[PDB]
Amino acid sequence: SRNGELCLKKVIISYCPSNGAPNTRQFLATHLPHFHAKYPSVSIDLRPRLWPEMAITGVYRDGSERSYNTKNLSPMGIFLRLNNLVSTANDYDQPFCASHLHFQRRSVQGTWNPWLWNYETERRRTEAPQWRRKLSEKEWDYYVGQYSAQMKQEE
Amino acid sequence: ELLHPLPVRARKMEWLKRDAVEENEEILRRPYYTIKSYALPPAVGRQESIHNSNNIRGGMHSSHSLDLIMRQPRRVKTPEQLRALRDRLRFIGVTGPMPQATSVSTKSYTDTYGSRLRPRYPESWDTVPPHQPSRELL
Amino acid sequence: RYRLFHPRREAIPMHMCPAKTIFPLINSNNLLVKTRNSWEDFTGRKEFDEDHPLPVVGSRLNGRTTQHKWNHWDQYLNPQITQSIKDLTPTPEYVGMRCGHNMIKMGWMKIGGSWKYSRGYNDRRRVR
Amino acid sequence: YSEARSNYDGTSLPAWPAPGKKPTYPAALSELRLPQPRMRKTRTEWMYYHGHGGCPGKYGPSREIADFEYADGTPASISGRRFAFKHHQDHLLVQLIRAAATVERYDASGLLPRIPGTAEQRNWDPAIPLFLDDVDEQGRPAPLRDPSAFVSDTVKLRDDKRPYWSRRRWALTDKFLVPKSPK
Amino acid sequence: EEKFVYFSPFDYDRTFALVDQCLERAETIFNEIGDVEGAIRVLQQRKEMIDKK
Amino acid sequence: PKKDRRFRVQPLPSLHANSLADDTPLVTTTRTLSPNFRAFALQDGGVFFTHPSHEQVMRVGQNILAEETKATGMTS
Amino acid sequence: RPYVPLGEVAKLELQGDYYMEGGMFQEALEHYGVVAKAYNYAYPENHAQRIGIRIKLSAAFRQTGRLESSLANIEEVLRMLDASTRPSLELICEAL
Amino acid sequence: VNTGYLLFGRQSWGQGFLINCPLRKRDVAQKLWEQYKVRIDPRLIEFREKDRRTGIQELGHNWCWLYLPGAEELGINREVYDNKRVKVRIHVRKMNSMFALY
Amino acid sequence: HYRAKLELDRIRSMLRGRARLERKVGLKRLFFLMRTQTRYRVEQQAHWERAIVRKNVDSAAREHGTGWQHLRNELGRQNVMLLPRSQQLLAQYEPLAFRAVVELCASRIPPPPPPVVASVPEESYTLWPPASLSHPAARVELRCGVERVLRRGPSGLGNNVNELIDAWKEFDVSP
Amino acid sequence: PFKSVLRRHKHHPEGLPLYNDMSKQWLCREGERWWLLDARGEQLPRVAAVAAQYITGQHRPDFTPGMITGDHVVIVNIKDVVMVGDQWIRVPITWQTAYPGGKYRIRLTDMYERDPCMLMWWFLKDEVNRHFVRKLKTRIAPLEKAWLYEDSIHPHADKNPRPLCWTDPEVKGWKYRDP
Amino acid sequence: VTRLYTSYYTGVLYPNQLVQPKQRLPADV
Amino acid sequence: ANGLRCPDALITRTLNPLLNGPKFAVIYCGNHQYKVAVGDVIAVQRLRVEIGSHIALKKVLMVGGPRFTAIGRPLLEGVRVTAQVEEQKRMRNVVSLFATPGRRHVRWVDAPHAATIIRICEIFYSPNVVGELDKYKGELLETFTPGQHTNPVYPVDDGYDVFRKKDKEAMENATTFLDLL
Amino acid sequence: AAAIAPGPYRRVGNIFIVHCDDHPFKHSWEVNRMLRELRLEFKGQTTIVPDIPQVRKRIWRVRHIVKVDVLDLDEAKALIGVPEHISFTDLASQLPPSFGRVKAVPSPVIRSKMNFMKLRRMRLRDVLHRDALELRLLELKRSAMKNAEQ
Ligand SMILES: [Mg+2]
């Protein structure tokens, strides 16, 4: 059911009114009007014939046929295969895989291209004590203090 | 046959198995019960002192809120308050009589709606009632 | 690491379910007990509304089911529906023909199965 | 619309501090009695910490919360697995309550011993004290008026070698020994 | 116990339970007021209901 | 038993044990565009990041490229 | 239909009849009150769950000594069952 | 203690004959209590020079030393092998996951 | 014995000459193929593919000067719960969001506190009645429920809590 | 069959294709960038690893196994490449020719005598073959994206190779473990 | 072997679990 | 979308234009996480929902625009993700074939994987922001100013390390623009 | 105040949360019997058991598999919102016996007939209900006919 419209159009149901294999006649009796009242848009065409095809068939809005074998299947099962007919648009069968979970691929921000993060370089939290720099006086005194300290202990 | 040596991290993990086992047996040597008073918090004396010094310094643990429940004073402080609360408590699904000499015309759920009939519960994901009341009567 | 150190208190987190789940009103004083006490006693899915019906899609306990043959109870109630000879099936204790092999010491085996254990069976079959 | 709960009530700790104060952090150390390994918490341990099981798909918010509402707010329906999960989740509670009940009628009946551990644990483990009453544990009573002094644990890291740089100490340190592989 | 599986009617249709205790209440009221024919009518309808089920 | 051919993650600089202390995350990302990602605190406990868009970042990249190639000219 | 967080109010409702089943009626009454305001807003006229919960609400009023309120409510339930297209066969039974 | 020979068994993986959970002084003293019912302070035990650094850790026959402190009060001499020591004899056997611990 | 000849007889078109021509040869080929792929799918590809995913997320972290080894840990620490597949989707289709995740990790921003143990209200311990009223714990929990009803989205119920508790009095006929 | 029997061969005069110049479904050159790897002082094997991963295309977030998209790495100064300790003298290079006498056991020093470039090519071969063996096109195609120049003179000024700034996280020296 | 159901156990699929419709009052009445 | 909300006005007027335009969400459904756009179509594992119904999705891990990114620690509040059930169908058969070489037993197990196929309609977001958050030093920053960088960022060259590998000098001195202005 | 707490004194026991960290098929059948008594089947299962001596006798033997945690009952009352004036004995007295896997019955046949009897009591419940109704109806008809004839 896409954009408020069912993709199913016809359901073909063929059966023999007098001969045997009651399941389809059961289905017409007890489960069909519950289906038709729930999905009014789907045209159901009934085909009485002497040697009936025992398969159900859907016809979709792209001109696609889909059928299920109903031979000596309970009307519960037939009802269920019918409701399986409605719930599919019959466009595709993709496997259920990780790459098939998203039918189309889309980027809101943008796709990664090699050049967006390329021109970034590593940076530091707090600014650098540059090696080559003019020492302040306190700095002079502290560093000369350190050098003189290690020289003193060594000598 | 076994040819090449066991890697170092494997036997490291085996050492960890050893002191996991030990960690268990320390638990096993703790007493069966503990004597506590009524007014004090539930954790006053506790075996975890060295455990708190070793693992517990500043970090917030997963048991935090529960431990916050432990380190405050007990809310029932005297036996009289205990039995004064406890006598008020009523048992609904209990077998046998229930005292009603006070007011007769207050009917319970059972003598109104019977033993076979539970109220229709709104049934969805986050509200899930017990199904099939007839099963539970063993 | 596969050797994990943490209290096993978290293997069973109780944060999600307090006693308010099993005892509906425990913060009051009555101790009612509502426990859904099996996995067997599940009645089924049912709708919250009329507006949003539960979809109809089948399972193998639904979609694969044959048509109903009349059993012996349905022909007892209403003889009207015994219409032909196929309705005349015998006592239900009759399963069918012997469909397999009673192979000594391994089960009932299948026709077109493994014959590896048939030695005793074959030798028993040809006959202080 | 969307649901975020860590709890049955929906409550939490005050997740953010007052502006301009220091935050409280979780202990990053794996919780182990021994201080020496000092090992950072594993991803799995962090998931145990944050109120899941070890995996995203158990016991967390990622189970208890419905996958979908309807547009109008009409909620979902009860799966067989949802009901089974509720049964498990109450099975834990029934388990706990019954265990506690057993402990309580055991110390009502007075079968909880004053001696920790079973007899098998007692004669396995020299940690648990001897619970002897009126005698001293070690022979007769000690007088009332340091093992490590004589016990040597000094681990010698590098094995001392033989002085080939000196002629006299080479021959004076001679080891008269014949290598023999086991037969 | 797969052959003996039983499902109580007081579960799978709540309507039956409702009408059942409905008639139970009715019958009690008939006992209090002193109507014999009414009580017999009610218990007959209830019996017929239960074995209909 | 077969040799394992799955892809291996590159080794990453070893920690100095400073990381062990809580309040110090062991991910170190301090990068050029870092100050632009502004963190806000939601009522939920989740966070809210404010960042420059795709074309802004790439425009910054373009400016840096042009600014490195102003000297020697632009190669093919 | 207008958005109301039905999950939360439903949870509230079942807490409600746990209160009612548990032998305390006043509280079940206020609970049903809240939830019934919710359903009264969220659903159209004469909807099934609306009249359902005020069935429960009549039941709650009746137990607490507000009898006439219960009577009024249940008559309104009746006249709502009247105007329904095809009401549930369970609801009419429970109602009366 | 010296007359007794304390049977010991554990698990061994890898190539040469090593225990993947090496011994220490808290579980030598444990085996003493387990099968010989001998209660001593575990800090009286000292290992061999080779086994101090790694623990005991190797399969087969190992020996260790127990310091028995007080006797010159008792005049213990020449009736023992030496006044302060007992050779505590350990044997470590490798066993599978069925029968071993750790 | 069932070898599944009658299903696999329809597949042969995907086999080359000797197998597609002659029946039994082709059926052996298809039986072999499908059993093989079944085995492989259940035990191995699960590892191959998660290896690929780890590789992609890791390199995407490499561009930011860190790697999978830290990122895993601190996506664990701050309780983000992004599956690695999703981290791959973010790395490839939303580089800025992935970057934001990385810099949520690298920052010192306190991770959320552990979930709270559900606690008893104080008013449970108040005896009722003291000496047509509600147990105070019940009405407090009722409060707590109504607040979380009003918490989800906007609704016609309003944001004011009190009268919404008292809403049972509007269905009440005054005698 | 799908893959033909008549196949392009080394003795066949058509010759062996260069994958850089080839145009094929699984070859994408559009989004590549050029790198400059100075090998001064860095260990041979490590350089081989890093180069292998830029070359293979594994450094990208969108990297896919069947789609070969690499960056061109210009590896400069192969001559200054440092192999730790005795290893230059002790690390074998073994190959087996199919003919009577299937052993060539040849020291790193000898390979370094003949060509220094062949050493880097050898370890690149190894680090690429570590994840790709079972298909020839997946083994061979990446390797041509290495440009091995044994000193600081290279033709590639026109591609503006960006200096690849890399420090090896591994503290210890490389270790030869090959059964 | 006997099951303890100590760990989590999903329920079985069983026919009593069918979604049973609600009885409706007829249209004309 | 009802706009972002904060006790501070400047932060609200600053981040108000920030939330406009297409939004992607990351959604937890049936143990599978999804990147979700407005017009995107996903196949989730089977939900019991009538076809053509209108759905909101509760679990939302992350929401972001071209401009903002809201990272949910474990989950987010306020997110409205409205989708529409399109199909319910069983997807392409995965045939598993189990045969033991010793036994003559062959088992053919078909796994059509049942799925609900979902089309998405809206993504709306309305956060409640508390305050600006300092990320290098952990704090809630009390005063908010957009113009100044919350945490300024500094280049790495000391001159102290001779063997530091030199990336081109324009990469190493590059200062980045003020975004919020 | 540097003094012993004033008593009434209460005695509070403990509770063991037991977690299985190792495959039971690696271990002997005695260790497996102990793990069975601790209600552990596989690797990764967690159980809650009492602190009574027998349980410790069990946990001691399997300690190289099981990892343990301890909760005293005040802490167990805290872990779940439980008012402190409510003990666990009453809470146990409230919860139904009909809980899943109720008993330890000696062989699967007995288990089967236990469940079977569970169903039988259901059938007999409904049958006895209907039969009671028939009884009372019979008595009403008897009294009616007796009062009518007389
Ligand atoms: Mg798989």
Side-chain angles (χ1 to χ4, degrees), chain K residues 12-24:
Chain K
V12 295
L13 189 69
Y14 200 71
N16 65 341
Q17 295 180 6
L18 274 147
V19 180
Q20 55 183 356
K22 302 177 83 295
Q23 303 287 333
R24 297 285 183 183

Side-chain angles (χ1 to χ4, degrees), chain D residues 100-121:
Chain D
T102 300
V103 171
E104 281 190 356
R105 79 170 164 89
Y106 257 90
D107 74 346
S109 54
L111 277 87
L112 288 187
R114 288 185 290 270
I115 314 297
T118 58
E120 188 176 357
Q121 186 176 1

Side-chain angles (χ1 to χ4, degrees), chain D residues 81-118:
Chain D
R81 297 184 187 84
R82 177 63 177 172
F83 186 80
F85 174 71
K86 285 300 181 175
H87 171 71
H88 172 67
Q89 214 174 8
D90 298 346
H91 175 59
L92 297 169
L93 287 173
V94 168
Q95 214 151 20
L96 175 46
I97 290 176
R98 282 180 178 170
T102 300
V103 171
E104 281 190 356
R105 79 170 164 89
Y106 257 90
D107 74 346
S109 54
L111 277 87
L112 288 187
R114 288 185 290 270
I115 314 297
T118 58

Side-chain angles (χ1 to χ4, degrees), chain I residues 41-42 45-46:
Chain I
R41 172 254 305 317
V42 306
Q45 87 169 0

Side-chain angles (χ1 to χ4, degrees), chain I residues 40-47 49:
Chain I
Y40 161 72
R41 172 254 305 317
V42 306
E43 73 191 6
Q44 217 275 325
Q45 87 169 0
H47 296 286
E49 292 173 5

Side-chain angles (χ1 to χ4, degrees), chain L residues 6 34 38 56-57 65 70 77 93-94 96 104 124 139 147-148 156-157 166 170-171 179:
Chain L
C6 188
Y34 294 133
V38 176
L57 297 170
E77 287 183 346
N93 291 322
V94 179
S96 189
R104 313 170 167 179
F124 292 151
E139 279 104 356
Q148 140 273 352
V156 187
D157 207 345
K166 293 297 181 180
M171 317 284 184
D179 50 349

